[PDB]
Design a protein around this ligand. Structure first.
Ligand SMILES: Nc1ncnc2c1ncn2[C@@H]1O[C@H](COP(=O)(O)OP(=O)(O)OP(=O)(O)O)[C@@H](O)[C@H]1O
Ligand SMILES: Nc1ncnc2c1ncn2[C@@H]1O[C@H](COP(=O)(O)OP(=O)(O)O)[C@@H](O)[C@H]1O
Ligand SMILES: [Mg+2]
Lengths: 743, 58
């Protein structure tokens, strides 16, 4: 749309001094060949060059060297701008400093070998901070034009006095100037990034717009989210893009009990930041430093909140200073600090999803060498709840474990490690999976459990139940477009009920692995407390954790304990049980937007559960897990004995046929008993072999016969009759039968 | 100390009784201890992995 817009492209033969541009864009820009122009770059870096006409250069692209990419901090395909340099004059004196690593090892004078031929009749425009690489000698040498006169744009001419000697340059400073953090190093928060960009970059870029509309940019930025999510990273990145001085503030370090030290600390910090008027203040852990003045007993904290209020009131002063605060919990901050003019705008930064965490992995591993085998999509999929900081830790641990794997490859005896053997060591996908297993998501460290180690193949039978659970967890998250098209929200509730040992907990643990969604398991009575209002507090905090980790599967094993018919027990904590039930009712279906939180309940006694718990909208689908039938019993036996080495002569079909009333637990008991009999036989055989010195490949059929002689039915007939009665009550509640539409 | 370590190539620093001079800033008797902890954090972030100096603490 504009002639200035340009796409970065490589230069075949153009040096770092000049660039080649397409002739149609030359005429569109109304610029002559050899005109001194300026190119903009990221992090506010500019490169002055001589423009030229090239046929190979594309219309929408600018051909430019790699060192010019370093100078402008740009990469291939990026967007840059070109502007005519006005009132260009020849340089009278330029102070140019080679890098400190380049000077070492060069016997000859750097100016004569490199600077003099390059700058003899140069006519090459340069700007302060520009760096160019000169080929020649035993090693090519990099030169930085630190000073130019006239500043900041001048033309190099033979009359200009050029001397390499001077104050030594610093490699670390240039490396930092190259390795600064920008918006590109942030991923997965593009809507929050767009908000913050419109907040900060814009008023600096177009202040006349705000002046013409007569509004001032917001002087307060609050960032709230779980820790490690990048609240510090955005603040650090903004200062580089919009040239400023990042001034970090730690909440704990400012806080002091010296009776008035903390207020002086904040006031000094604000004064120091205002001194460097293009400044950004970052107040990390604002929640600790700023509680409610009335709520907190501590007078130091109420005074520090009041001082922060006073500083925020006078913060603007029509100055470039802006303040960004990070808090994990936003409600703990004093409501006065929530007002307009002080942190008036609050931005929520959430746990990254699959795409955002993939972007984080990409940007962290851009420097790391990546094999063709490794796919970071899979690494993002497996990290169901990892945070960006956790992702960075995972990336580092991966390479460290790769080094550990290649310890045996490196003999490390040589004084210098051989480069050819160096080449062999590289990262692998097994490395990523192992480091990922070792790495732990910090989002739900509180709810951490050992590996379920159960898959859908581990469960025999229940094919329809398996399909329904997979659809439940998968359709809303993988296909939200279809739910938007058909206009209705997904159902997010299932209650498993049935006799003990039939696979309800097994189904939940199978969900845990094969859903690619976070899983929180709540043992039934675990959430209750002896204190007056803390059981429902635990309920609402577990639901809050579920909402944060969406899509999450919230599983209540033995739900009949936490959920009862209200008023059933008068002495159950003086109505604390009923209050817990009411809290769960409000948390499942209340006046809050529904998240991707799927609540699964397992119970042996469904008739005692509160009817309000079981209505559609809370545990929508009531699924009965009955005693397996003969085919399902064959499936259970096959699932249990798939891992075991079992003889072919054994007939699992006959076992399933005879075990009429056996549950899955009973059949697993049969398999375990047969294996124990085999263990006894094999160990006794080994003892006999040892005795005769001084075997059994697969479990035989007679072992299973003895195990059956030790088999038993666990679930009584009265209990299963009760479960059938509950199911029949549901069916009678439906009414009628075989709903058929007329014509 | 850190300046001398980054000066020589390579270098190793050892810090015995790190907990003695680097306690929690949340629970600290003197503000000077908070200052030394913060300065230790700043100089810890000061190295850019290129000085190749490993700091050890007991
Ligand atoms: N259909 C099945 N397929 C495979 N194993 C099963 C099946 N049903 C039960 N089991 C076995 O039962 C054991 C545990 O059962 P599980 O925890 O799923 O029972 P449950 O139905 O939730 O009962 P409870 O009400 O007593 O908690 C495991 O060893 C599991 O392998
Ligand atoms: N969205 C993100 N993209 C890339 N890196 C991230 C992101 N979020 C966090 N990090 C990593 O976290 C580290 C900074 O911690 P940070 O997340 O800022 O903590 P806090 O959440 O307390 O501000 C950086 O090293 C950075 O690599
Ligand atoms: Mg169970």
């Amino acid at each position: 749309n504009r002639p200035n817009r340009l796409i970065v492209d490589e230069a075949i033969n153009e040096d770092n001094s000049v660039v080649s541009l397409s002739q149609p864009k030359m005429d569109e820009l109304q610029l002559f060949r050899g005109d001194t122009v300026l190119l903009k770059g990221k992090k506010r870096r500019e490169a002055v060059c001589i423009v030229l006409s090239d046929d190979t250069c594309s219309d929408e692209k600018i051909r430019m060297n790699r060192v010019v990419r370093n100078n402008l901090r740009v990469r291939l395909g990026d967007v840059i701008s070109i502007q005519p340099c006005p009132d260009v004059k020849y340089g009278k004196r330029i102070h140019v400093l080679p890098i400190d690593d380049t000077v070492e090892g060069i016997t000859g004078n750097l100016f004569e070998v490199y600077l003099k031929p390059y700058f003899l009749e140069a006519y090459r425009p340069i700007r302060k901070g520009d760096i160019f690489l000169v080929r020649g000698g035993m090693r090519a040498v990099e030169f930085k034009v630190v000073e130019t006169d006239p500043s900041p744009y001048c033309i190099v001419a033979p009359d200009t006095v050029i001397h390499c000697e001077g104050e030594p340059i610093k490699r670390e400073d240039e490396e930092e100037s190259l390795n600064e953090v920008g918006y590109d190093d942030i991923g997965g928060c593009r809507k929050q990034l767009a908000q913050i960009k419109e907040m900060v970059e814009l008023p600096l870029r177009h202040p006349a717009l705000f002046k013409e509309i007569g509004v001032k940019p917001p002087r307060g930025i609050l960032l709230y989210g779980p820790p490690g999510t990048g609240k510090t990273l955005i603040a650090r990145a903004v200062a580089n893009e919009t040239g400023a001085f990042f001034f970090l503030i730690n909440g704990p370090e400012i806080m002091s009990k010296l009776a008035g030290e903390s207020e002086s600390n904040l006031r000094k910090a604000f004064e120091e930041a205002e001194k460097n008027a293009p400044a950004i203040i970052f107040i990390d852990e604002l929640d600790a430093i700023a509680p409610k003045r009335e709520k907190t007993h501590g007078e130091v904290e109420r005074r520090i909140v009041s001082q922060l209020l006073t500083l925020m009131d006078g913060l603007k002063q029509r100055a470039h200073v802006i303040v960004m605060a990070a808090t994990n919990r936003p409600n703990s901050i004093d409501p006065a600090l929530r007002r307009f003019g002080r942190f008036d705008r609050e931005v929520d930064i959430g746990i990254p999803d699959a795409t955002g965490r993939l972007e984080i992995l990409q940007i962290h591993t851009k420097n790391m060498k990546l094999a063709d085998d490794v796919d970071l999509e899979q690494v993002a999929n497996e990290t169901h709840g990892h945070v960006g900081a956790d992702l960075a830790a995972l990336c580092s641990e991966a390479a460290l474990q790769a080094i550990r794997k290649k310890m045996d490859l490196i003999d490390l005896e040589d004084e210098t490690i051989d480069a050819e053997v160096m080449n062999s060591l590289a990262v692998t996908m097994d490395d990523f999976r192992w480091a990922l297993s070792q790495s732990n998501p910090s989002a739900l460290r509180e709810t951490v459990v050992e590996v379920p180690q159960v898959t859908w193949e581990d469960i025999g039978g229940l094919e329809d139940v398996k399909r329904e659970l997979q659809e439940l967890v998968q359709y809303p998250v993988e296909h939200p477009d279809k739910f938007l098209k058909f206009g209705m929200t997904p159902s997010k509730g299932v209650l498993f009920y049935g006799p003990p040992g039939c696979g309800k907990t097994l189904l939940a643990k199978a969900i845990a692995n094969e859903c690619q969604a976070n899983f929180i398991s709540i043992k039934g009575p675990e959430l209750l407390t002896m204190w007056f209002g803390e059981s429902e507090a635990n309920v609402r905090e577990i639901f809050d954790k579920a909402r944060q980790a969406a899509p999450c599967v919230l599983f209540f094993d033995q739900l009949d304990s936490i959920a009862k018919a209200r008023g059933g027990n008068i002495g159950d904590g003086g109505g604390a049980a009923d209050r817990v039930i009411n809290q769960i009712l409000t948390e499942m279906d209340g006046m809050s937007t529904k998240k991707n939180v799927f609540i699964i309940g397992a119970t042996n006694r469904p008739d005692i559960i509160d009817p309000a718990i079981l209505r559609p909208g809370r545990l929508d689908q009531l699924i009965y897990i009955p005693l397996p039938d003969e085919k399902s019993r064959v499936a259970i036996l096959k699932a249990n004995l798939r891992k075991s080495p079992v003889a072919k002569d054994v007939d699992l079909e006959f076992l399933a046929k005879m075990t009429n009333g056996f549950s899955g637990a009973d059949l697993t008991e049969i398999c375990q008993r047969a294996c124990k009999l085999a263990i006894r036989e094999s160990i006794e055989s080994e003892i006999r072999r040892e005795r005769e010195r001084q075997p059994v490949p697969e479990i035989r059929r007679d072992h299973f016969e003895e195990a059956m002689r030790f088999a038993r039915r666990s679930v009584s007939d009265n209990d299963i009759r009760k479960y059938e009665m509950f199911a029949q009550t549901l069916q009678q509640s439906r009414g009628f039968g075989s709903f058929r539409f007329p014509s």
